[PDB]
């Protein structure tokens, strides 16, 4: 299952894993700055570093010129610079829960299912034999086009290879030329893939 | 520069059916969908309906579900609205026209001149 | 198809003036409203887009306001290049759709 979630500044997003630990799939903050223009700024790294790995993680946004509080709440906040306060404002970000964020498969003739962040360089790699992808899929949900199916791409990349790179980012750059931020910040990969012998 | 490059004016029989073209250039064209909008004389805008050019899949508004085809050609970035059978009642500009970002937000950014189709004999 | 409209038809006003221009959904549409600007030579300009952000380029005289089903466009300081029609239009539910537009006359 993945959360796609839109949040305001302020608002507090509350993730939790029933079994498995989160992974960060993208991050985008989209703000007015102090030229009163909309801006885009990324926010992955801080997404990551609070929720990757773990059952559950809490955060919220926050101006760079702000009244500060003292309170237990603000353990959770991530300062955004360049953004000037306005309801314009808005955080776009995905997570899911995975029992496992390595992309080493340990065994052969099973389908493994996964997800694939929007800047990942990890390759997938078979323990024992070589992979063989079933499908693979750009998710977009956020964006008009919400779906491409990219299997034959990695499939021809990465078939009875021992290890295989996705990188949606050099996929979507190089395979299909794109240049459109809702895409290029916001794609993310899913796949199912078995090693065989 | 995004461009969208429609044909002045279309004449069309009574009856006979016609395929508007609508060439993008300068940007990747499956990146966007490529919408449709028609203006009668001395009246607003309506939709028509929009299409995906990765999988041929479109929408429709209500007023064109049979009125009109959308398809596209990939290779040379050319969109088509095809307009059957068509009546005087059909006389009216016929626009494409692309979002400017490819958030489900985004507006209508880009739009062609539009092609003034004339029903008459 | 979600129905929207405008409901003035044609609008009148002064140089410098400020005017308001409405626009309702028959359901919540949850922000997901565009402005468009067409001059009398039939061209078409997005002005705003999600409500309130301005498209590109376009003045910060021109403003979006509105939640649910109500939305309103605002220019302000008229000028003589305002001489429009003003439409607005959904797209929270595919297919979008336009209201009926508004004509704005500057008076002399």
């Known amino acids: 299952y993945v959360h796609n979630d839109v949040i305001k500044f302020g608002e507090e997003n509350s993730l939790k894993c029933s079994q498995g630990n989160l992974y960060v799939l993208h991050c985008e903050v989209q703000c007015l700055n102090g030229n009163n223009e909309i801006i885009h700024k990324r926010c992955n790294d801080d997404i990551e570093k609070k929720c990757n790995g773990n059952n559950k993680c809490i955060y919220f946004f926050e101006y760079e010129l702000r009244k500060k509080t003292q309170s237990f709440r603000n353990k959770n906040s991530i300062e955004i610079s360049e953004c000037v306060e306005s309801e314009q404002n808005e955080v776009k970000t995905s997570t899911t829960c995975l029992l496992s964020n390595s992309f080493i498969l340990d065994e052969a003739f099973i389908q493994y299912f996964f997800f694939i962040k929007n800047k990942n360089e990890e390759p997938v790699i078979c323990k024992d034999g070589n992979i063989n992808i079933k499908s693979a899929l750009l998710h977009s949900p956020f964006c008009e086009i919400k779906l491409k199916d990219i299997s034959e791409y990695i499939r021809k990349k990465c078939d009875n290879n021992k290890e295989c790179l996705i990188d949606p980012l050099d996929v979507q750059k190089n395979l299909l030329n794109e240049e459109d931020p809702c895409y290029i910040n916001n794609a993310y990969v899913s796949v199912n893939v078995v090693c065989n012998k | 520069q995004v461009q969208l490059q429609q044909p002045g004016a279309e004449l069309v029989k009574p009856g006979a059916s016609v395929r508007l073209s609508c060439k993008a250039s300068g940007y990747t064209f499956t990146s966007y969908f490529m919408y449709w909008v028609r203006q009668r004389p001395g009246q607003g805008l309506q939709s028509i309906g929009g299409i995906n050019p990765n999988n041929g899949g479109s929408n429709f508004n209500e007023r064109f579900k049979t009125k009109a085809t959308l398809t596209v050609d990939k290779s040379s970035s050319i969109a088509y609205l095809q307009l059957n059978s068509l009546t005087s009642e059909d006389s009216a500009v016929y626009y494409c026209?692309?979002?400017?970002?490819?958030?489900?937000?985004?507006?209508?950014?880009?739009w062609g001149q539009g092609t003034l189709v004339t029903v008459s004999a | 198809d979600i129905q929207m409209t405008q409901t003035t038809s044609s609008l009148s006003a002064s140089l410098g003036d400020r005017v308001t221009i409405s626009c309702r959904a028959s359901?919540?549409?949850?922000?997901?409203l565009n402005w468009y600007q067409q001059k009398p030579d039939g061209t078409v300009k997005l002005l705003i887009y999600?409500?309130?952000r301005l498209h590109s380029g376009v003045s910060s005289r021109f403003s979006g306001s509105g939640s649910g089903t109500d939305y309103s466009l605002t220019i302000k300081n008229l000028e003589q290049e305002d001489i429009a029609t003003y439409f607005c239009?959904?797209?929270?539910?595919?297919?979008?759709?336009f209201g009926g537009g508004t004509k704005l006359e500057i008076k002399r």
């Open positions: 239009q959904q797209v929270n539910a595919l297919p979008p759709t």
């Open positions: 359901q919540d549409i949850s922000n997901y």
């Open positions: 999600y409500t309130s």
């Open positions: 026209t692309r979002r400017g970002l490819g958030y489900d937000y985004g507006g209508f950014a880009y």
